[PDB]
Write a protein that binds this ligand. Structure first.
Ligand SMILES: CC(C)S[C@@H]1O[C@H](CO)[C@H](O)[C@H](O)[C@H]1O
Ligand SMILES: CC(C)S[C@@H]1O[C@H](CO)[C@H](O)[C@H](O)[C@H]1O
Ligand SMILES: [Mg+2]
Ligand SMILES: [Mg+2]
Ligand SMILES: [Mg+2]
Ligand SMILES: [Mg+2]
Ligand SMILES: [Mg+2]
Ligand SMILES: [Mg+2]
Ligand SMILES: [Mg+2]
Ligand SMILES: [Mg+2]
Ligand code: NA
Ligand code: NA
Ligand code: NA
Ligand code: NA
Ligand code: NA
Ligand code: NA
Lengths: 1011, 204, 193
């Protein structure tokens, strides 16, 4: 039969899809959502055997355990147990494209379980097995008898086992196929794994049972009144004595309740549904649900007899909220949303694709703490608990069908094909049947990167017809097709158009106004956070706030998909594509998250938190105007803290309670600003703090911040009469300067400061030299490759230009004595294949105070690619415990990604100045620094810097962070200017013009002195 | 050109057509017809089938065709003759001036139907003037309305030819048989003969 | 597998649908819609035997003619040949409503044909069989080997027989079921044949 190579067969004997059931036999347990005795978990230790193909599976396995099998935990992905390699491929299918066939060598996991079944479950009622997740297709046998088959690795497959079980011990056998015709619709950009990876359960239902229930909530014009409508269907023998009661609870208070016998209204010439009934309940002044205040009620649906005996009860959490698109705006409860979203795959570094509650909670909390209010289920229906958590903690969810055919050519080859309609329809229809009662789901998605075909149009209308309560979106085919209610592009930029043929990505501001366009625009993916990224993030947020119809987006993406590997010594390290011998693969493209696989944040996360803040501020005089971007709640768990400091030194501060209605404003007068005693720049910082803990944050959580410069008093105070005058000693090879116990040496042939001593201690391992390059970021590399260079990527432009190969040529090296100092003057050219790339002119003035003033004027040829940086670098001989600076921080920040950082005096251990991106690159810069302290050294100016135990050379030569080794000393990069990091996308040049170093001539100055 | 989908005997009529599990099967009936017949100029309108109520499957399929072949309108009478799955109001047996206000699926007078609040589609009866036996009384009343009202664009009489079958007597002589004459039961007797012409094509 | 009681299986190994083809190898012929040597009719005299249920059909029939069979003209409705009664029901289904199952007693028509295929057809290219109308579902075998299955009594079902035929004589075996899950979608007010 080879059902796994026939898209016309997506299952055999599988039961209908439906919302989460537990078959409680006590209404109160249903109301309180307690564990039901009728819903058993079969998770735990199973038996498992790996085979190279289904043909190799022995028939004996159907009836008995194979002795060579191992005992393993289920749910699991068999790759995470080492049976075979997980593969990381992005677009290209992991199997040859020859639909609907799959390789003959098709890894097959044989799982089995011996378990008991109580006679009470068999004597009456129906016992079914439910597999919430099997990747990618499977056959099921019970007690050696075949039961059925199922596909769609992302939704539950259920089978009735009533006639196959016997009281006592029973055996289940599951043959799981890694590949199947289903794989053609599962080409998402993630690790390709397989197995029984989601829960396995047994559910007992009465023969006369609730077989489906739909709950809807409609409102009057101002949401002050609602009608709860619950349509209930039954299976079994209809009897006049049957009844349905639907009751609605708000905590312990019964808000409403209604009962009726079965028998729906007339539908057509043939009548109505005798096996269904609709209950309608009136609710006055309902508590509305939103991500802001996730108010929930509990709906309990009881199937019972007239006399009152309960047959069974089902239930769900209900959130009263309306989602509609009107006048081109996505409204929730009549207010336009601003989606602060993120795409989140289900990934664990140890367990692969198996999800657990702990991890889900951890994620949700971090999300909320970081000012996210929405999540897109990229790109398949999630483990069921996810929705329950979003409903309760409050997150808007985009639920997305498990359909992705990115690897086809062209992309809609299958989706425009009627033969694939059935398979696709199941992926959509079964998702809706399962999740439609969850308030957190506000928008349905037809899948991802599958082009646009007629099948989409068919399914878009199906959904609109069955569930008018939620908009439908879909990005394929150009983001604004007839299959989407929302313009939902991926990586369209804010101002810049990318006019690709057929499926252009217009600037989002322009897209809204194309002739005839009226829909809202919410990016389904934007700001690709791969490595050191998120540059330009503030530009999106500024546009979102200015344009009503720009209603936000989902960052790509939440968490890095790295997997743990163990070295020779058993130590763990983070692996990416290719690290399992998987080939071909897409290397580091699987790590695009705001957080590391273990949940530790990347620096980008703070930039997202700040730009996604819910309070905006303005300053005028001593007036701070706070505006609330909340749509529904008042600021009843917030205080405003303010502090004024002079170059890092606290002068004053205070706190004022925040009392702003949704969308309102509050004016706070700051008190009289006592002058200050000292030159310096005064800075005002404000922070919004939540005094009380909440379900998702601890007391004291900071939810918003902003800074402003206040007055500045330039220093007009002429120094002092230097105690001494440095001495210059000239020799054929060098210019030496001595002053007290310090000495500086300038080599006359290289033209650089090659050594500096404090007493008899050398302070340098490598001379101080100009640096114009950086160890390329993921964004600089883009898709360029060794075996296939992308000439357009920044890294390739710089390579080709000779930037990493150019060598300094001396032009001038002179020494002069002035009245109280010695002045060294130098000039160098950097050339490549006879072309002058850069010219650096400097002066070093060493005075009686021991301060060394460095002036740098650089020329950059106009025709060379704009350089990554214009700075100096050196390897210091020493290593020190801390790094202290007055500049932006505390975390890593770059020119196009520094809004979240604050100007202040920061002090961290050296290691925190290094960002352990899995794929190493330039990292840890801090910009806007006026003073930097390390060991006995102090550098003053207006620069950007990074400091760590790793040379740029090392970072660029090293593929994985676990392979980096601390070098001797400390490498310090101090930049007058540094290029933006980009990130609009990571497969093309993405650094905005304004962040490129294209001025041609640059000047910067620094003072190096001893502390 | 009409899809081979009719589920008249279900209770209610859209039991299967509103069931996603029957979407695939229905889908092949509509898609394979369009793929086969879309180059014939004589086909001017596609129909989703007949007397199968109105279910979400219809909506999906109506959209499918609109997407693949914009060149022809799509009609479907199920569920009231004026649902979201039809470009043309295409009732069966709606009368000229007299309303028949059945619950859920009324059959309004055709003149009145055109102008119900918000209605703007053309109206062409998919079936009218049931020519069973000595019939066709009131035919001229339809025609007078069709000519007076722009949006009343005609209709398809029910139907062309009697579905009578030939049987042979004891003497071997032939005779026209109907429902129940083959031992078939239950059966609907003479309801199978509704045509303007006899089974041999002689006109009534 | 009782494919005829499962709406999830409406065909097996069936070729994609498409507009009328004739594969002319002369363009002039195509211009004038003349008969094509590449489009052959299998209409005429076939072998047929009636059974009360699919379970009653003998395996032998897959490989050789049943001597009991009769010779009849195809196309035809077997009711018109007297093998069983045609039924005239308007709305009410002719079988009990219990989707997607059908009666156990399900009249089965076993059709077969021995026909010649020239080597020229097999040396190059693809040879497919086209059944323009089979009511209501059927399985097909060619030279004793199973080929595929089809539903929808009103559209053509096509199968690639390239790998199943041999030069000279060949034998098709078609088992046609009167009722199937497809009958649930075929309740038109007309004789049921
Ligand atoms: C590399 C582009 C041509 S496709 C690009 O790849 C990304 C890599 O993380 C994501 O998967 C995006 O969804 C996809 O559009
Ligand atoms: C008799 C009605 C309830 S159904 C009525 O029966 C007719 C009889 O010829 C036709 O089949 C019609 O299409 C059908 O609407
Ligand atoms: Mg299959
Ligand atoms: Mg993709
Ligand atoms: Mg590769
Ligand atoms: Mg009768
Ligand atoms: Mg079938
Ligand atoms: Mg010829
Ligand atoms: Mg022979
Ligand atoms: Mg009918
Ligand atoms: Na906006
Ligand atoms: Na990726
Ligand atoms: Na407050
Ligand atoms: Na690197
Ligand atoms: Na008219
Ligand atoms: Na009739």
């Amino acid at each position: 039969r080879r059902d796994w190579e026939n898209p016309g067969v997506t299952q055999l004997n599988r039961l209908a899809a439906h919302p989460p059931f537990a078959s409680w036999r006590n209404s109160e347990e249903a109301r309180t959502d307690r564990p039901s005795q009728q819903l058993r978990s079969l998770n735990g230790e199973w038996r498992f055997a790996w085979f190279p193909a289904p043909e190799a599976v022995p028939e004996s396995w159907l009836e008995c355990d194979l002795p060579e099998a191992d005992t393993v935990v289920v749910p699991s992905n068999w790759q995470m147990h080492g049976y075979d390699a997980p593969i990381y491929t992005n677009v290209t299918y992991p199997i040859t494209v020859n639909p609907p066939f799959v390789p003959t060598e098709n890894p097959t996991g044989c799982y089995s379980l011996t378990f008991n079944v109580d006679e009470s479950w068999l004597q009456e009622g129906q016992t079914r097995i439910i597999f919430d997740g099997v990747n990618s297709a499977f056959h099921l046998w019970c007690n050696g008898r075949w039961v059925g088959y199922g596909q769609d690795s992302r939704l539950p497959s259920e089978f009735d086992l009533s006639a196959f079980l016997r009281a006592g011990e029973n055996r289940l056998a599951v043959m799981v196929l890694r590949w199947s015709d289903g794989s053609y619709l599962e080409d998402q950009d993630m690790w390709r794994m397989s197995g029984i990876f989601r829960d396995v359960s047994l559910l007992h239902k009465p023969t006369t049972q609730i077989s489906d229930f739909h709950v809807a909530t409609r409102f009057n014009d101002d949401f002050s009144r609602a009608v709860l409508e619950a349509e209930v269907q039954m299976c079994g023998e209809l009897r006049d004595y049957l009844r349905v009661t639907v009751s609605l609870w708000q905590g312990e208070t019964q808000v409403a309740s209604g009962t009726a016998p079965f028998g729906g209204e007339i539908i057509d010439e043939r009548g109505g549904y005798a096996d269904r009934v609709t209950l309608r309940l009136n609710v006055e002044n309902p508590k509305l649900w939103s991500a802001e205040i996730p108010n929930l009620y509990r709906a309990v649906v009881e199937l019972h007899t007239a006399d009152g005996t309960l047959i069974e009860a089902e239930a769900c959490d209900v959130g009263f909220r309306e989602v509609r698109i009107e006048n081109g705006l996505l409204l929730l409860n009549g207010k336009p949303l601003l989606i602060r979203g993120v795409n989140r795959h289900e990934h664990h570094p140890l367990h692969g694709q198996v999800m657990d509650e702990q991890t889900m909670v951890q994620d949700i909390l971090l999300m909320k703490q970081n000012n996210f209010n929405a999540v897109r289920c990229s790109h398949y229906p999630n483990h069921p608990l996810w929705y329950t958590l979003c409903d309760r903690y409050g997150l808007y969810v985009v639920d997305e069908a498990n359909i992705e055919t990115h690897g086809m050519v062209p992309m809609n080859r299958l989706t425009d094909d009627p033969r694939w309609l059935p398979a696709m329809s199941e992926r959509v229809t079964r998702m809706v049947q399962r999740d439609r009662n969850h308030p957190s789901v506000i928008i349905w998605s037809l899948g991802n990167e599958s082009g646009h075909g007629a099948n989409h149009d068919a399914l878009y209308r199906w959904i609109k017809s069955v569930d008018p309560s939620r908009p439908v979106q879909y990005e394929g085919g150009g983001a604004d097709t007839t299959a989407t209610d929302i313009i939902c592009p991926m990586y369209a930029r804010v101002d810049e158009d990318q006019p690709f043929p057929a499926v252009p990505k217009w600037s989002i501001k322009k897209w809204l106004s194309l002739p005839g366009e009226t829909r809202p625009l919410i990016l389904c993916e934007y700001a690709h956070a791969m490595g050191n990224s998120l540059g330009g993030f503030a530009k999106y947020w500024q546009a979102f706030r200015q344009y009503p119809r720009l209603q936000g987006g989902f960052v790509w993406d939440w968490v890095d998909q790295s997997l743990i590997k163990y070295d020779e010594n058993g130590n763990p390290w983070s692996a990416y594509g290719g690290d399992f011998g998987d080939t071909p693969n897409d290397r580091q493209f699987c790590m695009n998250g705001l957080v590391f696989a273990d949940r530790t944040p990347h620096p980008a996360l703070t930039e997202a938190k700040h730009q996604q803040q819910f309070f905006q501020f303005r300053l005028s005089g001593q007036t701070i105007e706070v505006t609330s971007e909340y749509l529904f709640r008042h600021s009843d768990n917030e205080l405003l803290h303010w502090m004024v400091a002079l170059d890092g030194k606290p002068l004053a501060s205070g706190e004022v309670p925040l009392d702003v209605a949704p969308q309102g404003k509050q004016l706070i007068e700051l008190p009289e600003l006592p002058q200050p005693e000292s030159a310096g720049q005064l800075w005002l910082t404000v922070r919004v703090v939540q005094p009380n803990a909440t379900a998702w944050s601890e007391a004291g959580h900071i939810s918003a911040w902003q800074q402003w410069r206040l007055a500045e008093n330039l220093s007009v105070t002429l120094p002092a009469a230097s105690h001494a005058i440095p001495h210059l000693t000239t020799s054929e090879m060098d210019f030496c300067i001595e002053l007290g116990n310090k000495r500086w040496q300038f080599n006359r042939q290289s033209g650089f400061l090659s050594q500096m001593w404090i007493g008899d201690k050398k302070q340098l391992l490598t001379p101080l030299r100009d640096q114009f390059t950086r160890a390329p970021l993921d964004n600089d590399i883009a898709v360029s490759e060794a075996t296939r260079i992308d000439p357009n990527a920044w890294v390739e432009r710089w390579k080709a230009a000779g930037h990493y190969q150019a060598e300094a040529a001396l032009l001038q090296c002179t020494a002069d004595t002035l009245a109280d100092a010695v002045l060294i003057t130098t000039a160098h050219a950097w050339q490549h294949q006879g072309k002058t790339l850069f010219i650096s002119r400097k002066t070093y003035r060493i005075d009686g105070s021991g301060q060394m003033a460095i002036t740098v004027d650089v020329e950059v040829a106009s025709d060379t690619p704009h350089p990554a940086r214009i700075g100096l670098n050196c390897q210091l001989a020493q290593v020190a415990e801390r790094v202290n600076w007055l500049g932006l921080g505390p975390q890593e920040n770059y020119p196009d990604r520094l809004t979240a950082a604050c100007f202040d005096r920061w002090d961290l251990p050296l290691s925190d100045m290094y960002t352990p991106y899995v794929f190493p690159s330039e990292n840890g810069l801090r910009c806007g620094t006026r003073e930097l302290n390390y060991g006995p050294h102090q550098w003053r100016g207006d620069f950007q810097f990074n400091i760590s135990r790793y040379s740029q050379q090392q970072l660029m030569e090293t593929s994985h962070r676990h392979l980096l080794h601390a070098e001797e000393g400390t490498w310090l990069n101090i930049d007058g200017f540094h290029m933006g990091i980009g990130g609009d996308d990571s497969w093309s040049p993405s650094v905005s013009a304004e962040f490129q170093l294209s001025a041609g001539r640059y000047h910067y100055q620094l003072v190096w002195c001893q502390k």
